[PDB]
Structure 1
Amino acid sequence: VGEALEYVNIGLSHFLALPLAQRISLIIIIPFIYNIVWQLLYSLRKDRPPLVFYWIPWVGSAVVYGMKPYEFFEECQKKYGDIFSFVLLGRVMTVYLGPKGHEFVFNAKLADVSAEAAYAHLTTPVFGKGVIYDCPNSRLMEQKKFVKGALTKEAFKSYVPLIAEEVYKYFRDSKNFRLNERTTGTIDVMVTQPEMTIFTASRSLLGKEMRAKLDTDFAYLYSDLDKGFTPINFVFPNLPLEHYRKRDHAQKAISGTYMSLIKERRKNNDIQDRDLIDSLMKNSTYKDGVKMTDQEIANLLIGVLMGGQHTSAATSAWILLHLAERPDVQQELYEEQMRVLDGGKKELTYDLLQEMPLLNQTIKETLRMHHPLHSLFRKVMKDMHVPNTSYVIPAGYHVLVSPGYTHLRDEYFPNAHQFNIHRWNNDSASSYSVGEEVDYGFGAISKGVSSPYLPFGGGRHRCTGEHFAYCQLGVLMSIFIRTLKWHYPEGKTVPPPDFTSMVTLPTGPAKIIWEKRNPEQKIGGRH
């Protein structure tokens, strides 16, 4: 029976003869049907985690994961346990929930997983080339080592009065406050916190020159570049549209400003220990002798500042929002300010910040309820066996880990959805290496990453901005608490999170009503 093969060919010929309606109709029915037939077959493998079923091909569970990622995970965890895959915008994501997932992903061997393959398409078009994820891991490890050189205790000692002054200036001059002229007012915390975060971070990490730029129309380039930081970069990283060209123009104009300051400092040999720019100028030689270019130094600055912008601004937005319905906590924090700072007669110092455990537990608890990053990912480079299982995660998959999900589990945090800074009494550290330690190129960090509380990640990709974030959030909240009481308009409460930015932001407009503790207090200086 070669007669059959002839009819194969005849059928192929008649196929290409169909009316164009039926040919496009067939162009959609065939992949859909195949997609379901493939999942059903896939769901038989014993060496693959369960795969979340989905109707639309390529799209996958993208809509559900994107809008309600922790709800998606809880549903999947109830059905399939702690390991399961789901299709997402063309990728397969293998999720591993809970502390053993933290260990599987955050401590995966450098050979098995790649962060830069996962992230580069999100960050490289915003930050620029050659740094962070547009470079091999060992370069990244050392860039973190260079940034850490400016994030020392002694640096934080000089940043505290800089950050504090910036907050007072903001209270004095910003339209949102004007404390010298109003005793009460209403703000949207998603306007005020992003602005306060960029002003305080610029002044301390970037220096006075870069801070001064933000009082000009130059500040619009930060807005344009900020807009370019979006999950759309995973599908359309470059499209010949205005959004993208404004992004690229901002990246070039902003990195040009940094290089101009860098080259002017070197031209005058004016390199002190003022800011992170001084620091990187003195210290950006890799261990194989290669030196970072002024452009790579500038792109590193953008990426570090931009990442710290979003996480910190989100977090201080959430602190304000939780305290607006917790007058008890504001009272509690105010008393600690009065006791640590001798009734407000002692100036805030970095040392005194460490003696304010309730303030630091408020940051800590906010990073529990509202982790700014619901998902961290790697691309799997070599097949991985899931220990004590029959599961194998093949190369070309992605592993996804979500400590923010574990932060919200009653099993690890009793009453996980109640905001209680006292769940941290006797434990106000920003995190804790609770045992051994290892160095990946930027300093010794906890060897284990099994803690259920992992707001700053762990392993080779762990955050290097933790202590800067606490310093900055600490000075800002110390001043907010000693200066203002605040509350919600009638009937309003803590807004639910918006996860689509991939930074967990309050849903707007998130407004609070502030009023001066001392209506007669005046903020000195010029305006």
Structure 2
Amino acid sequence: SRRRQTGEPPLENGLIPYLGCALQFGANPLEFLRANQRKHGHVFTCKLMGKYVHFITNPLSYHKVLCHGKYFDWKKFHFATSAKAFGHRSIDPMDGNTTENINDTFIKTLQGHALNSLTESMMENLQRIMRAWVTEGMYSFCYRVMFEAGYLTIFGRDLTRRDTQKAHILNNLDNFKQFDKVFPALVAGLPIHMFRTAHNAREKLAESLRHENLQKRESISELISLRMFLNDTLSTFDDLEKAKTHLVVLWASQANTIPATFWSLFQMIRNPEAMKAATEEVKRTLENAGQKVSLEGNPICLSQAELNDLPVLDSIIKESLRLSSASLNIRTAKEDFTLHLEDGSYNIRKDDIIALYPQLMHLDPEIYPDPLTFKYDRYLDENGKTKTTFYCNGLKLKYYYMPFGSGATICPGRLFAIHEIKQFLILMLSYFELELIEGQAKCPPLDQSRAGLGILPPLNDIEFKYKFKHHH
């Protein structure tokens, strides 16, 4: 058993299998982390996921962890977790299965010219999918629409199989739901065969993502066409493993985007001021880009710049994620060393984890007054432009909004994710009349079973009503 040595942080004994564990018994990961802050101050160590995990919780010390330090390994833990959860051999080039740098592949094909073609394809796919009042769970609606749109955008479409396209997508959606469901457990080292349904779901998704089946598809993303090419040319992976590297991309493209979309839609519709400000901005932008909206007419086309210069939508989305983001931001100690923070100096052993839990900052009332209130204009300045000035103890923060991470540990899809959510909100507002069945119903609590994993979904779905607009 491990004992706190000299200069080491306070050590909380107790095994925490994973952050969302024991939710059914009344566990609350956020409040648990807060309670340790009060007990131990801003740096403490938990036995978390079979690791020793040093939480750094002072917003003003974040920059000391997010810089490219000499004793930080920002990939080891991620690579190992991906292997476990998806079931493939290591993709760390250091283990000799590939010479590919997957991060460069993501950056290369998720930004620049590639991003433009993704964005354009998503807009086209969203309109094909989205074109009386219908009542439905809002999460379930966002799941259908966004899953299909994102799947077809990243993995292209099977045009030989047109009439069985809705069957294939519904199977995939269902399989994805069942696999993603158990993901918090998988990351933690719990065996997938404890989850027979999720295990079958996973392998069925992997099957559908074998190169043999992806070669039948057209308008495949540049990301997946390149990843196929480098699987083939730079790795000694077998055919199933290859399929699972594409499953890693399916999961990453989907697991945060779906709940982010829900929250952004829910929070807009729920708050009449947000809805009015969003509705006007979208009208103004479509009007003077000359884009007509109709169900049967020609599609809408928006420039990168027109999509990007939507500050109200950006603020709505940022505020939605400030409230729902629950990532564990992680790196591993390359060796024994001393970490120097504003809070003091702490000795860290080799292979210890150094973690941030930025939800603690996002909900900090010192940085964000009334932190639990959705303020649609929170990230707008006096000019109605995107606001970038936020403070802690009078000091201007470099890191204050982190739902995509930061540094080298940063979502390569982040610009695309924002584009796709903006596109969805644009189309929802343009195409439909929208009402909450319970306009006064409390906001669902976050479901903290996925704490650590990204954007948290609602604990319960909420019903809403939608109706195609008539344009006069």
For 2:414, the aligned partner's letter is E
CA distance in 2, matches of 1:136, 1:429: 44
Checking the alignment, whether the CA contact within 8 Å between 2:105 and 2:223 is kept in structure 1 is no
CA distance in 1, matches of 2:457, 2:194: 31
Specify which of 26, 45, 56 is matched with residue 85 of structure 1.
45
Question: Which residues in structure 2 correspond to 1:286-301 (within 5 Å)?
Answer: 298-301=243-246
Question: Which residues in structure 2 correspond to 1:63-142 (within 5 Å)?
Answer: 63=22, 67-107=27-67, 109=69, 111-117=71-77, 120-121=80-81, 123-130=82-89, 142=101
CA distance in 2, matches of 1:83, 1:393: 12
Question: Which residues in structure 2 correspond to 1:213-228 (within 5 Å)?
Answer: 215-217=166-168, 218-219=171-172, 220-228=174-182
- The Cα offsets for residues 440-491 of structure 1, whole Å up to 9 and x where unpaired, read as xxxxxxxxx9412222212222110101101111100111122232324154
Aligned to 2:292: 345
For 2:292, the aligned partner's letter is K
Checking the alignment, whether the CA contact within 8 Å between 1:221 and 1:250 is kept in structure 2 is yes
SS in 1 for 2:313: helix
CA distance in 2, matches of 1:133, 1:67: 35
Specify which of 399, 411, 415 is matched with residue 354 of structure 2.
399
Corresponding position: 1:364 with 2:315: no
Task: Compute the displacement of 1:150 (Å).
Answer: 2.5
Corresponding position: 1:278 with 2:231: no
Task: Compute the displacement of 1:364 (Å).
Answer: 1.7
- The Cα offsets for residues 183-229 of structure 1, whole Å up to 9 and x where unpaired, read as x2322122122222221112222212399676225424434443452
- The Cα offsets for residues 5-45 of structure 1, whole Å up to 9 and x where unpaired, read as xxxxxxxxxxxxxxxxxxxxxxxxxxxxxx8xx87xx4xx5
Checking the alignment, whether the CA contact within 8 Å between 1:147 and 1:276 is kept in structure 2 is yes
- The Cα offsets for residues 354-374 of structure 1, whole Å up to 9 and x where unpaired, read as 232211221122222221x43
CA distance in 1, matches of 2:202, 2:258: 23
Aligned to 1:329: 274
Corresponding position: 1:451 with 2:451: no
CA distance in 1, matches of 2:88, 2:388: 32
CA distance in 1, matches of 2:318, 2:96: 29
Aligned length: 442
- The Cα offsets for residues 68-95 of structure 1, whole Å up to 9 and x where unpaired, read as 2222222222222211112235432210
Aligned to 2:416: 468
Q: Over alpha carbons, which structure has the higher Rg?
A: 1
Question: Which residues in structure 2 correspond to 1:251-270 (within 5 Å)?
Answer: 251-256=205-210, 258-262=211-215
- The Cα offsets for residues 92-126 of structure 1, whole Å up to 9 and x where unpaired, read as 221001344433433353643354335623x3244
Corresponding position: 1:477 with 2:425: yes
Task: Compute the displacement of 1:395 (Å).
Answer: 1.8
CA distance in 2, matches of 1:230, 1:110: 30
Task: Compute the displacement of 1:302 (Å).
Answer: 1.6
For 1:185, the aligned partner's letter is V
Runs of 5+ consecutive residues of structure 1 not aligned to the other structure: 1-34, 173-181, 433-448, 523-527
CA distance in 2, matches of 1:425, 1:283: 42
CA distance in 1, matches of 2:356, 2:100: 20
Point out the more displaced range, 301-310 or 223-232: 223-232
SS in 1 for 2:62: helix
Checking the alignment, whether the CA contact within 8 Å between 2:74 and 2:331 is kept in structure 1 is yes
Specify which of 461, 469, 472 is matched with residue 510 of structure 1.
461
CA distance in 2, matches of 1:203, 1:136: 33
CA distance in 2, matches of 1:241, 1:454: 32
Checking the alignment, whether the CA contact within 8 Å between 1:116 and 1:137 is kept in structure 2 is no
CA distance in 2, matches of 1:162, 1:509: 32
CA distance in 1, matches of 2:100, 2:78: 17
Question: Which residues in structure 2 correspond to 1:158-169 (within 5 Å)?
Answer: 158-169=117-128
Aligned to 2:339: 386
CA distance in 2, matches of 1:500, 1:140: 36
Aligned to 1:320: 265
CA distance in 1, matches of 2:373, 2:155: 37
1:171–1:304: structure 2 CA closer, same or farther, 3 Å change rule? same
CA distance in 2, matches of 1:409, 1:81: 15
Task: Compute the displacement of 1:498 (Å).
Answer: 0.7
CA distance in 2, matches of 1:510, 1:223: 15
CA distance in 1, matches of 2:208, 2:379: 41
Specify which of 90, 94, 102 is matched with residue 143 of structure 1.
102
Aligned to 1:4: none
1:512–1:303: structure 2 CA closer, same or farther, 3 Å change rule? same
Specify which of 373, 378, 403 is matched with residue 423 of structure 1.
378
Point out the more displaced range, 57-66 or 71-80: 57-66
For 1:249, the aligned partner's letter is E
Point out the more displaced range, 388-397 or 193-202: 388-397
SS in 1 for 2:422: helix
1:418–1:474: structure 2 CA closer, same or farther, 3 Å change rule? same
For 1:355, the aligned partner's letter is D
CA distance in 2, matches of 1:60, 1:333: 38
Task: Compute the displacement of 1:333 (Å).
Answer: 0.6
1:422–1:498: structure 2 CA closer, same or farther, 3 Å change rule? same
- The TM-score normalised by the length of structure 2 is 0.80
CA distance in 1, matches of 2:387, 2:207: 36
Corresponding position: 1:185 with 2:134: yes
SS in 1 for 2:465: strand
Checking the alignment, whether the CA contact within 8 Å between 2:206 and 2:240 is kept in structure 1 is no
1:370–1:332: structure 2 CA closer, same or farther, 3 Å change rule? same
Aligned to 2:297: none
SS in 1 for 2:327: coil
For 2:259, the aligned partner's letter is A
1:135–1:405: structure 2 CA closer, same or farther, 3 Å change rule? farther
Aligned to 1:436: none
CA distance in 1, matches of 2:220, 2:252: 23
Amino-acid identity (%) = 19
CA distance in 2, matches of 1:500, 1:399: 22
CA distance in 2, matches of 1:85, 1:320: 37
Larger strand proportion, structure 1 or 2? 2
1:157–1:391: structure 2 CA closer, same or farther, 3 Å change rule? closer
Tell me the C-alpha RMSD between the 2 structures.
3.8
